[PDB]
Design an enzyme around this catalytic site. Structure first.
Site, PDB file in Angstrom:
ATOM      1  N   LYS B  10     -12.236  13.342  18.849  1.00  0.00           N
ATOM      2  CA  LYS B  10     -10.761  13.602  19.416  1.00  0.00           C
ATOM      3  C   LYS B  10     -10.000  12.527  19.291  1.00  0.00           C
ATOM      4  O   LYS B  10     -10.162  11.487  19.333  1.00  0.00           O
ATOM      5  CB  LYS B  10     -11.078  13.913  20.961  1.00  0.00           C
ATOM      6  CG  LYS B  10      -9.719  14.678  21.616  1.00  0.00           C
ATOM      7  CD  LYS B  10      -9.680  15.875  21.162  1.00  0.00           C
ATOM      8  CE  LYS B  10     -10.337  16.818  22.314  1.00  0.00           C
ATOM      9  NZ  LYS B  10     -10.295  18.248  21.875  1.00  0.00           N
ATOM     10  N   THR B  57     -15.408  17.958  21.107  1.00  0.00           N
ATOM     11  CA  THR B  57     -14.632  17.069  21.149  1.00  0.00           C
ATOM     12  C   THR B  57     -13.811  17.136  22.579  1.00  0.00           C
ATOM     13  O   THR B  57     -13.432  16.032  22.867  1.00  0.00           O
ATOM     14  CB  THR B  57     -13.467  17.222  20.005  1.00  0.00           C
ATOM     15  OG1 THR B  57     -12.729  18.431  19.957  1.00  0.00           O
ATOM     16  CG2 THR B  57     -14.068  17.234  18.625  1.00  0.00           C
ATOM     17  N   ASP B  58     -13.808  18.161  23.009  1.00  0.00           N
ATOM     18  CA  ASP B  58     -13.326  18.287  24.295  1.00  0.00           C
ATOM     19  C   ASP B  58     -14.195  17.455  25.495  1.00  0.00           C
ATOM     20  O   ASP B  58     -13.428  16.894  26.282  1.00  0.00           O
ATOM     21  CB  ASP B  58     -13.325  19.630  24.851  1.00  0.00           C
ATOM     22  CG  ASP B  58     -12.551  19.885  26.093  1.00  0.00           C
ATOM     23  OD1 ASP B  58     -11.343  20.134  26.150  1.00  0.00           O
ATOM     24  OD2 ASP B  58     -13.546  19.861  27.061  1.00  0.00           O
ATOM     25  N   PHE B 159      14.113 -16.511  -3.097  1.00  0.00           N
ATOM     26  CA  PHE B 159      13.169 -15.756  -4.067  1.00  0.00           C
ATOM     27  C   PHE B 159      13.909 -15.863  -5.503  1.00  0.00           C
ATOM     28  O   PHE B 159      14.574 -15.423  -5.884  1.00  0.00           O
ATOM     29  CB  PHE B 159      12.936 -14.403  -3.639  1.00  0.00           C
ATOM     30  CG  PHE B 159      11.859 -13.545  -4.627  1.00  0.00           C
ATOM     31  CD1 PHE B 159      10.672 -14.319  -4.405  1.00  0.00           C
ATOM     32  CD2 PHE B 159      11.889 -12.765  -5.437  1.00  0.00           C
ATOM     33  CE1 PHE B 159       9.612 -13.665  -5.068  1.00  0.00           C
ATOM     34  CE2 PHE B 159      10.973 -12.224  -6.029  1.00  0.00           C
ATOM     35  CZ  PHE B 159       9.628 -12.784  -5.843  1.00  0.00           C
ATOM     36  N   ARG B 176      19.151 -15.349   1.065  1.00  0.00           N
ATOM     37  CA  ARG B 176      18.781 -14.043   1.352  1.00  0.00           C
ATOM     38  C   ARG B 176      18.480 -13.758   2.443  1.00  0.00           C
ATOM     39  O   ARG B 176      18.039 -14.600   3.572  1.00  0.00           O
ATOM     40  CB  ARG B 176      18.108 -13.316   0.323  1.00  0.00           C
ATOM     41  CG  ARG B 176      16.425 -13.653   0.680  1.00  0.00           C
ATOM     42  CD  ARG B 176      15.642 -12.936  -0.482  1.00  0.00           C
ATOM     43  NE  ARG B 176      14.074 -13.073  -0.132  1.00  0.00           N
ATOM     44  CZ  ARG B 176      13.251 -12.366  -0.552  1.00  0.00           C
ATOM     45  NH1 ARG B 176      13.270 -11.473  -1.440  1.00  0.00           N
ATOM     46  NH2 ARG B 176      12.083 -12.686  -0.179  1.00  0.00           N
ATOM     47  N   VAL B 227       7.809 -13.509   0.486  1.00  0.00           N
ATOM     48  CA  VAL B 227       6.950 -13.149   1.807  1.00  0.00           C
ATOM     49  C   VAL B 227       5.479 -13.561   1.642  1.00  0.00           C
ATOM     50  O   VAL B 227       4.866 -13.892   2.434  1.00  0.00           O
ATOM     51  CB  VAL B 227       7.015 -11.486   1.661  1.00  0.00           C
ATOM     52  CG1 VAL B 227       6.226 -10.673   2.549  1.00  0.00           C
ATOM     53  CG2 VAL B 227       8.492 -11.251   1.872  1.00  0.00           C
ATOM     54  N   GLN B 228       5.071 -13.455   0.338  1.00  0.00           N
ATOM     55  CA  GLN B 228       3.644 -13.999  -0.146  1.00  0.00           C
ATOM     56  C   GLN B 228       3.458 -15.414   0.600  1.00  0.00           C
ATOM     57  O   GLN B 228       2.326 -15.446   1.450  1.00  0.00           O
ATOM     58  CB  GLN B 228       3.241 -13.904  -1.434  1.00  0.00           C
ATOM     59  CG  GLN B 228       3.551 -12.625  -2.150  1.00  0.00           C
ATOM     60  CD  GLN B 228       4.660 -12.054  -2.656  1.00  0.00           C
ATOM     61  OE1 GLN B 228       5.885 -12.358  -2.261  1.00  0.00           O
ATOM     62  NE2 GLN B 228       4.609 -11.444  -3.861  1.00  0.00           N
ATOM     63  N   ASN B 254       9.167  -5.674   2.731  1.00  0.00           N
ATOM     64  CA  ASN B 254      10.289  -6.398   2.586  1.00  0.00           C
ATOM     65  C   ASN B 254      11.493  -5.252   2.696  1.00  0.00           C
ATOM     66  O   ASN B 254      11.692  -4.603   1.648  1.00  0.00           O
ATOM     67  CB  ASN B 254      10.504  -7.058   1.141  1.00  0.00           C
ATOM     68  CG  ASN B 254      11.338  -8.137   1.176  1.00  0.00           C
ATOM     69  OD1 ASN B 254      12.293  -8.270   1.956  1.00  0.00           O
ATOM     70  ND2 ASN B 254      11.225  -8.878   0.078  1.00  0.00           N
ATOM     71  N   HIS B 256      14.873  -4.120   2.556  1.00  0.00           N
ATOM     72  CA  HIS B 256      15.879  -5.152   1.564  1.00  0.00           C
ATOM     73  C   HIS B 256      17.231  -4.864   2.186  1.00  0.00           C
ATOM     74  O   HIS B 256      17.502  -3.795   2.716  1.00  0.00           O
ATOM     75  CB  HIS B 256      15.899  -4.585   0.170  1.00  0.00           C
ATOM     76  CG  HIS B 256      14.717  -4.712  -0.360  1.00  0.00           C
ATOM     77  ND1 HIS B 256      14.144  -5.932  -0.560  1.00  0.00           N
ATOM     78  CD2 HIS B 256      14.068  -3.900  -0.925  1.00  0.00           C
ATOM     79  CE1 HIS B 256      12.850  -5.752  -1.304  1.00  0.00           C
ATOM     80  NE2 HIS B 256      12.896  -4.467  -1.620  1.00  0.00           N
TER      81      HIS B 256
HETATM   82  O1  LIG Z   1     -14.815  23.751  15.503  1.00  0.00           O
HETATM   83  C1  LIG Z   1     -14.773  23.293  16.630  1.00  0.00           C
HETATM   84  N1  LIG Z   1     -15.330  21.917  16.653  1.00  0.00           N
HETATM   85  C2  LIG Z   1     -15.812  20.824  17.175  1.00  0.00           C
HETATM   86  O2  LIG Z   1     -16.531  19.822  17.122  1.00  0.00           O
HETATM   87  C3  LIG Z   1     -15.176  21.111  18.719  1.00  0.00           C
HETATM   88  N2  LIG Z   1     -15.372  20.448  19.812  1.00  0.00           N
HETATM   89  N3  LIG Z   1     -14.458  21.109  20.607  1.00  0.00           N
HETATM   90  N4  LIG Z   1     -14.072  22.240  20.142  1.00  0.00           N
HETATM   91  C4  LIG Z   1     -14.515  22.308  18.943  1.00  0.00           C
HETATM   92  N5  LIG Z   1     -14.137  23.425  17.875  1.00  0.00           N
HETATM   93  O1  LIG Z   2       9.370 -12.237  -1.364  1.00  0.00           O
HETATM   94  C1  LIG Z   2       9.376 -11.343  -2.299  1.00  0.00           C
HETATM   95  N1  LIG Z   2       8.457 -11.231  -2.952  1.00  0.00           N
HETATM   96  C2  LIG Z   2       8.415 -10.321  -4.282  1.00  0.00           C
HETATM   97  O2  LIG Z   2       7.118 -10.245  -4.640  1.00  0.00           O
HETATM   98  C3  LIG Z   2       9.511  -9.819  -4.496  1.00  0.00           C
HETATM   99  N2  LIG Z   2       9.617  -8.976  -5.519  1.00  0.00           N
HETATM  100  N3  LIG Z   2      11.184  -8.822  -5.393  1.00  0.00           N
HETATM  101  N4  LIG Z   2      11.730  -9.232  -4.372  1.00  0.00           N
HETATM  102  C4  LIG Z   2      10.679 -10.010  -3.743  1.00  0.00           C
HETATM  103  N5  LIG Z   2      10.659 -10.842  -2.816  1.00  0.00           N
END
Ligand SMILES: O=c1[nH]c(=O)c2nn[nH]c2[nH]1
Ligand SMILES: O=c1[nH]c(=O)c2nn[nH]c2[nH]1
Ligand SMILES: O=c1[nH]c(=O)c2nn[nH]c2[nH]1
Ligand SMILES: O=c1[nH]c(=O)c2nn[nH]c2[nH]1
Ligand code: NA
Ligand code: NA
Ligand code: NA
Ligand code: NA
Lengths: 295, 295, 295, 295
Positions: B10, B57-58, B159, B176, B227-228, B254, B256
């Site tokens: 779920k 799942t219920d 940069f 920048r 950034v790197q 990034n 821009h």
């Molecule tokens: O098709 C279903 N699969 C499940 O595993 C399930 N569990 N609750 N309802 C369900 N319906």
């Molecule tokens: O920080 C940055 N890293 C990048 O790799 C890059 N490429 N364009 N501008 C950038 N600025």
């Protein structure tokens, strides 16, 4: 057929601006997303392929950057008013400019307990927005707002005494979770033009701060009777603290957290006073709205 | 044909848990999204419609809530180990449990400068995650990470000196903007089982805190050559501060921000030293990866 | 510390290409999103700020457009192989190129029952993808897939006979809804290089078509015992129809539709044979996986 | 302070419905997302914590499923009118019901050239929507629409003759790509109530079909002078084919595809007549709007 209404322009214009203090080395950044839609004597672009009346949306885009270059971009109410005013003053046949601005958060980092001169963090997707409608002969109408402010309280929320009939299954509760995404709008008195907007510049940041502070404090301290009752308290207080606002609007989803009855499993008790594990519900959700004005 | 690999369970199980201190009234909330996928002697459910081998799942969903009810949900490394261990110990024919947990932020609100006992705010969509693989006869393998930590620095990023050939148009730069969304993973020494995980419980929160603190401080203080080069410095420091980690992985876009030449407009100067208004680019984006280990 | 692994490049490169037949006026469009990540003797960019070993990501971006300009962009398996081969052949110190391509749908419009020469519609967000890993001295490894194929059957799905213990609440059913988003991957025999890929060009489109056709027909016609059993049938058939594939992988969410008991309301019957209105569940969801190979 | 406006209810209610023909075995599915917001004499829930006036949103949710159980869910204009009418008739103090419905596509699969009795495919995220406002004493106002219809034409789009001044950099073009996401709304004559809506039931599906057909054919065949000119032609034709519509609204983004000058690279020619490879722009985008009525 005839054109009954028309507006056009550029949406989703991302804008960054930096301010650098040459003396202190402190830098300050602003980032927004801007939409500008124009109205005017443009119906023939639609009905007669007459593009001569069109200020190209690409040009509106250029104008947004040029205006940000030549003017402060804060508070957004001011920037939007300057931008909108430009279009209606520059083009005789353009009579309204509709400017929407979404401000993105770039909060200064604190490194080793000291504010950093040029490094920022996006602390939440909460936005500060404006809708500035600049209409020739009708001044400037501004709606300011905060949105995407997501909060939760784990107790001191209630909901009982609601209507019960044949469609009702909801149990009354005296202790529940309340979570929402706050969308709050304050609508300013009409301004006659850009000079009047300028005369109130300090009130824009101050009112945004008040709106946020009131929202958070009321949410946290109100032992809530309902979303309706709590949001009304917020609106009332904001109106009492800024007389230049005419109305306050709240839009609040009730993002439900359901109890999980586990008594089927070894008699585990996880409801009422024993409730510890809950299931957040993605959908559906209550949606509660109100616009509050002065009596 | 034959089944070469299979896992099922779920996904997207939202879980909330509250802790209430009866003495102080302080409440603490936890919210996560959980995925549990099982492996084992289950191939006949696929090849022979033999559902007898399937733990529904219920049922896995129920088990997630029941386990959260009976055990601490923090640190997520511990919760995931308890959950995964349950499945392989409870079902003889289940031999591996793969548990992914995304922890959502619910930070206590400060109201009037004082921490509130039961109100919280989602301060950013930054997540704290774990991937806990519980494999019978092979212990517990844990990968911890932080993700969606969005940051920007407005200077002290460079940069230059990169390879230049007939495919190259990028100008070298000595100043920048650098913005990214940090995805950082630390991989723990294999643990023999749940007891060993328990013996190191305090190190999980501590190492997450170190990873975040190192990330932010290095980002803010490194006059970055790329950034790197910057991400490598982060990885090195984390490895030096927690000997139980074997490797550190960084995944950094990034994002821009392009200069906008406005000299075509009234000779406006907005490039190089005069650069104030920039255009954030939504796409494309640089993507920079590395896994750093001990020499 | 030491670099244990490293790869870098440009992600989210949107590419459009048009083909125009000068004779017939028929135009054909292709749109994709491309990621290229390189590996090689690049560790010193991370450890010593040695950017001389870096092919700038901006240059990788340029190279993607130039390669699309000089070569067919279809089938994506071929384009990705040409692109990846370029990097490892052009740069002596680059030893692997990892190319991911997402193909977007632009299906020709039919207007008045006749195919239009240059108008297209995005009929669904279903994607056709490739992952092409070009590794020097190790040929080309290609994984092809379809994803985001969303389907629903309203009957002829069952789930009974699963394990029942103290964690089980799910009722057995002999008639349920089954809905999923199909993610299907076929892994090709290793190719020695670009010439071998070229020798099989027609099989790429043909195998994608078979995969889709088998998926849809099996989904529609199998009176399903489970997701597991149905997906296995799909995988088996695809493997039997293309001997150059080594394995088939399926990743299927069970997007649940729950009955709604309305008998509390005027004795309305909406369960079992009377079930007409259901509640689609956004989360959680079952997630079922398997990789099928040759016996 | 005073409440100036208020509306509340349940949003994001997912609904599925199946119809089974007992004679032919053919099944037909419908899936939607529903929002219902109510207005009325509810101000005291906001101002006085008086929840007695509140029809719980949970109850509104129940009512949506019960109404889908007892009534046809197609056409959505009819379903929304029945749903909205229920609230204002059932609750004396509720005077308006605002119903929004998003219809999701479940198109019957064709297997081996024959329509399958109970298997469906989501062919695109295109939606069919309605906004039904049921107001006591003011009838029913319906706005119908299609949205998320994404299209592209690779030629026969132009844009020249637009205004050029000191803010203009855009080159005139006589051959460009045009791509958009169509949002088209037709506003119906006011209806006096549910009986009148029922009297026009066949026109809802027919008008949706016409709107879509006109949209697609005009987009494909118009050698477009601009988005404005093309969208106007669509609106005109729809109005001429359904006299019960008062206005037609279009909302169209211009999703730009930029040429890529590659002449810097070995003199490659990829512009104007030689343009084959383009860069789709995610943002910004033109946004063009108009509402067309009868002269
Ligand atoms: O098709 C279903 N699969 C499940 O595993 C399930 N569990 N609750 N309802 C369900 N319906
Ligand atoms: O920080 C940055 N890293 C990048 O790799 C890059 N490429 N364009 N501008 C950038 N600025
Ligand atoms: O605060 C609330 N307001 C409502 O109107 C409501 N309806 N259901 N639950 C609710 N909670
Ligand atoms: O069709 C178009 N309309 C416009 O208003 C416009 N502005 N720039 N490009 C445009 N294209
Ligand atoms: Na004007
Ligand atoms: Na076991
Ligand atoms: Na090489
Ligand atoms: Na009424």
């Amino acid at each position: 057929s005839a054109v009954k209404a028309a507006r056009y322009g550029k949406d989703n214009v991302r804008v960054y601006k930096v301010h650098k203090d040459e003396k202190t080395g402190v830098q300050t950044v602003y980032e927004m997303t801007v939409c500008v839609l124009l109205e005017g004597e443009i119906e023939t672009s639609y009905t007669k392929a007459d593009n001569s009346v069109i200020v190209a949306t690409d040009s509106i885009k250029n104008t947004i950057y040029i205006t940000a270059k030549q003017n402060p971009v804060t508070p957004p109410e001011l920037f939007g008013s300057i931008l909108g005013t430009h279009f209606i003053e520059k083009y005789n046949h353009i009579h309204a400019a509709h400017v929407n601005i979404v401000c993105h958060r770039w909060t200064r980092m604190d490194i080793d307990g000291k504010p950093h001169p040029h490094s920022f963090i996006r602390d939440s997707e909460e936005k500060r927005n404006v809708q500035v409608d600049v209409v020739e002969g009708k001044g400037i109408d501004i709606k300011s707002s905060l949105s995407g402010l997501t909060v939760l309280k784990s107790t001191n929320s209630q909901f009982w005494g609601f209507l019960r009939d044949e469609y009702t299954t909801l149990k009354e509760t005296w202790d529940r979770i309340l979570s929402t995404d706050v969308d709050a709008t304050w609508q300013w008195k009409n301004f006659s033009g850009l000079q009047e907007v300028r005369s109130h510049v300090p009130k824009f940041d101050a009112t945004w701060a008040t709106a946020r502070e009131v929202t958070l404090k009321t949410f946290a301290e109100d032992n809530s009777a309902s979303v309706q009752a709590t949001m009304y308290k917020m609106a009332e207080q904001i109106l009492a603290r800024q007389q230049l606002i005419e109305t306050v609007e709240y839009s609040l989803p009730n993002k439900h957290y359901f109890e999980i009855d586990l008594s089927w499993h070894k008699g585990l008790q996880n409801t009422g006073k024993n409730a510890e594990v809950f299931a957040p519900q993605s959908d559906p959700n209550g949606l509660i709205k109100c616009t509050v004005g002065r009596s």
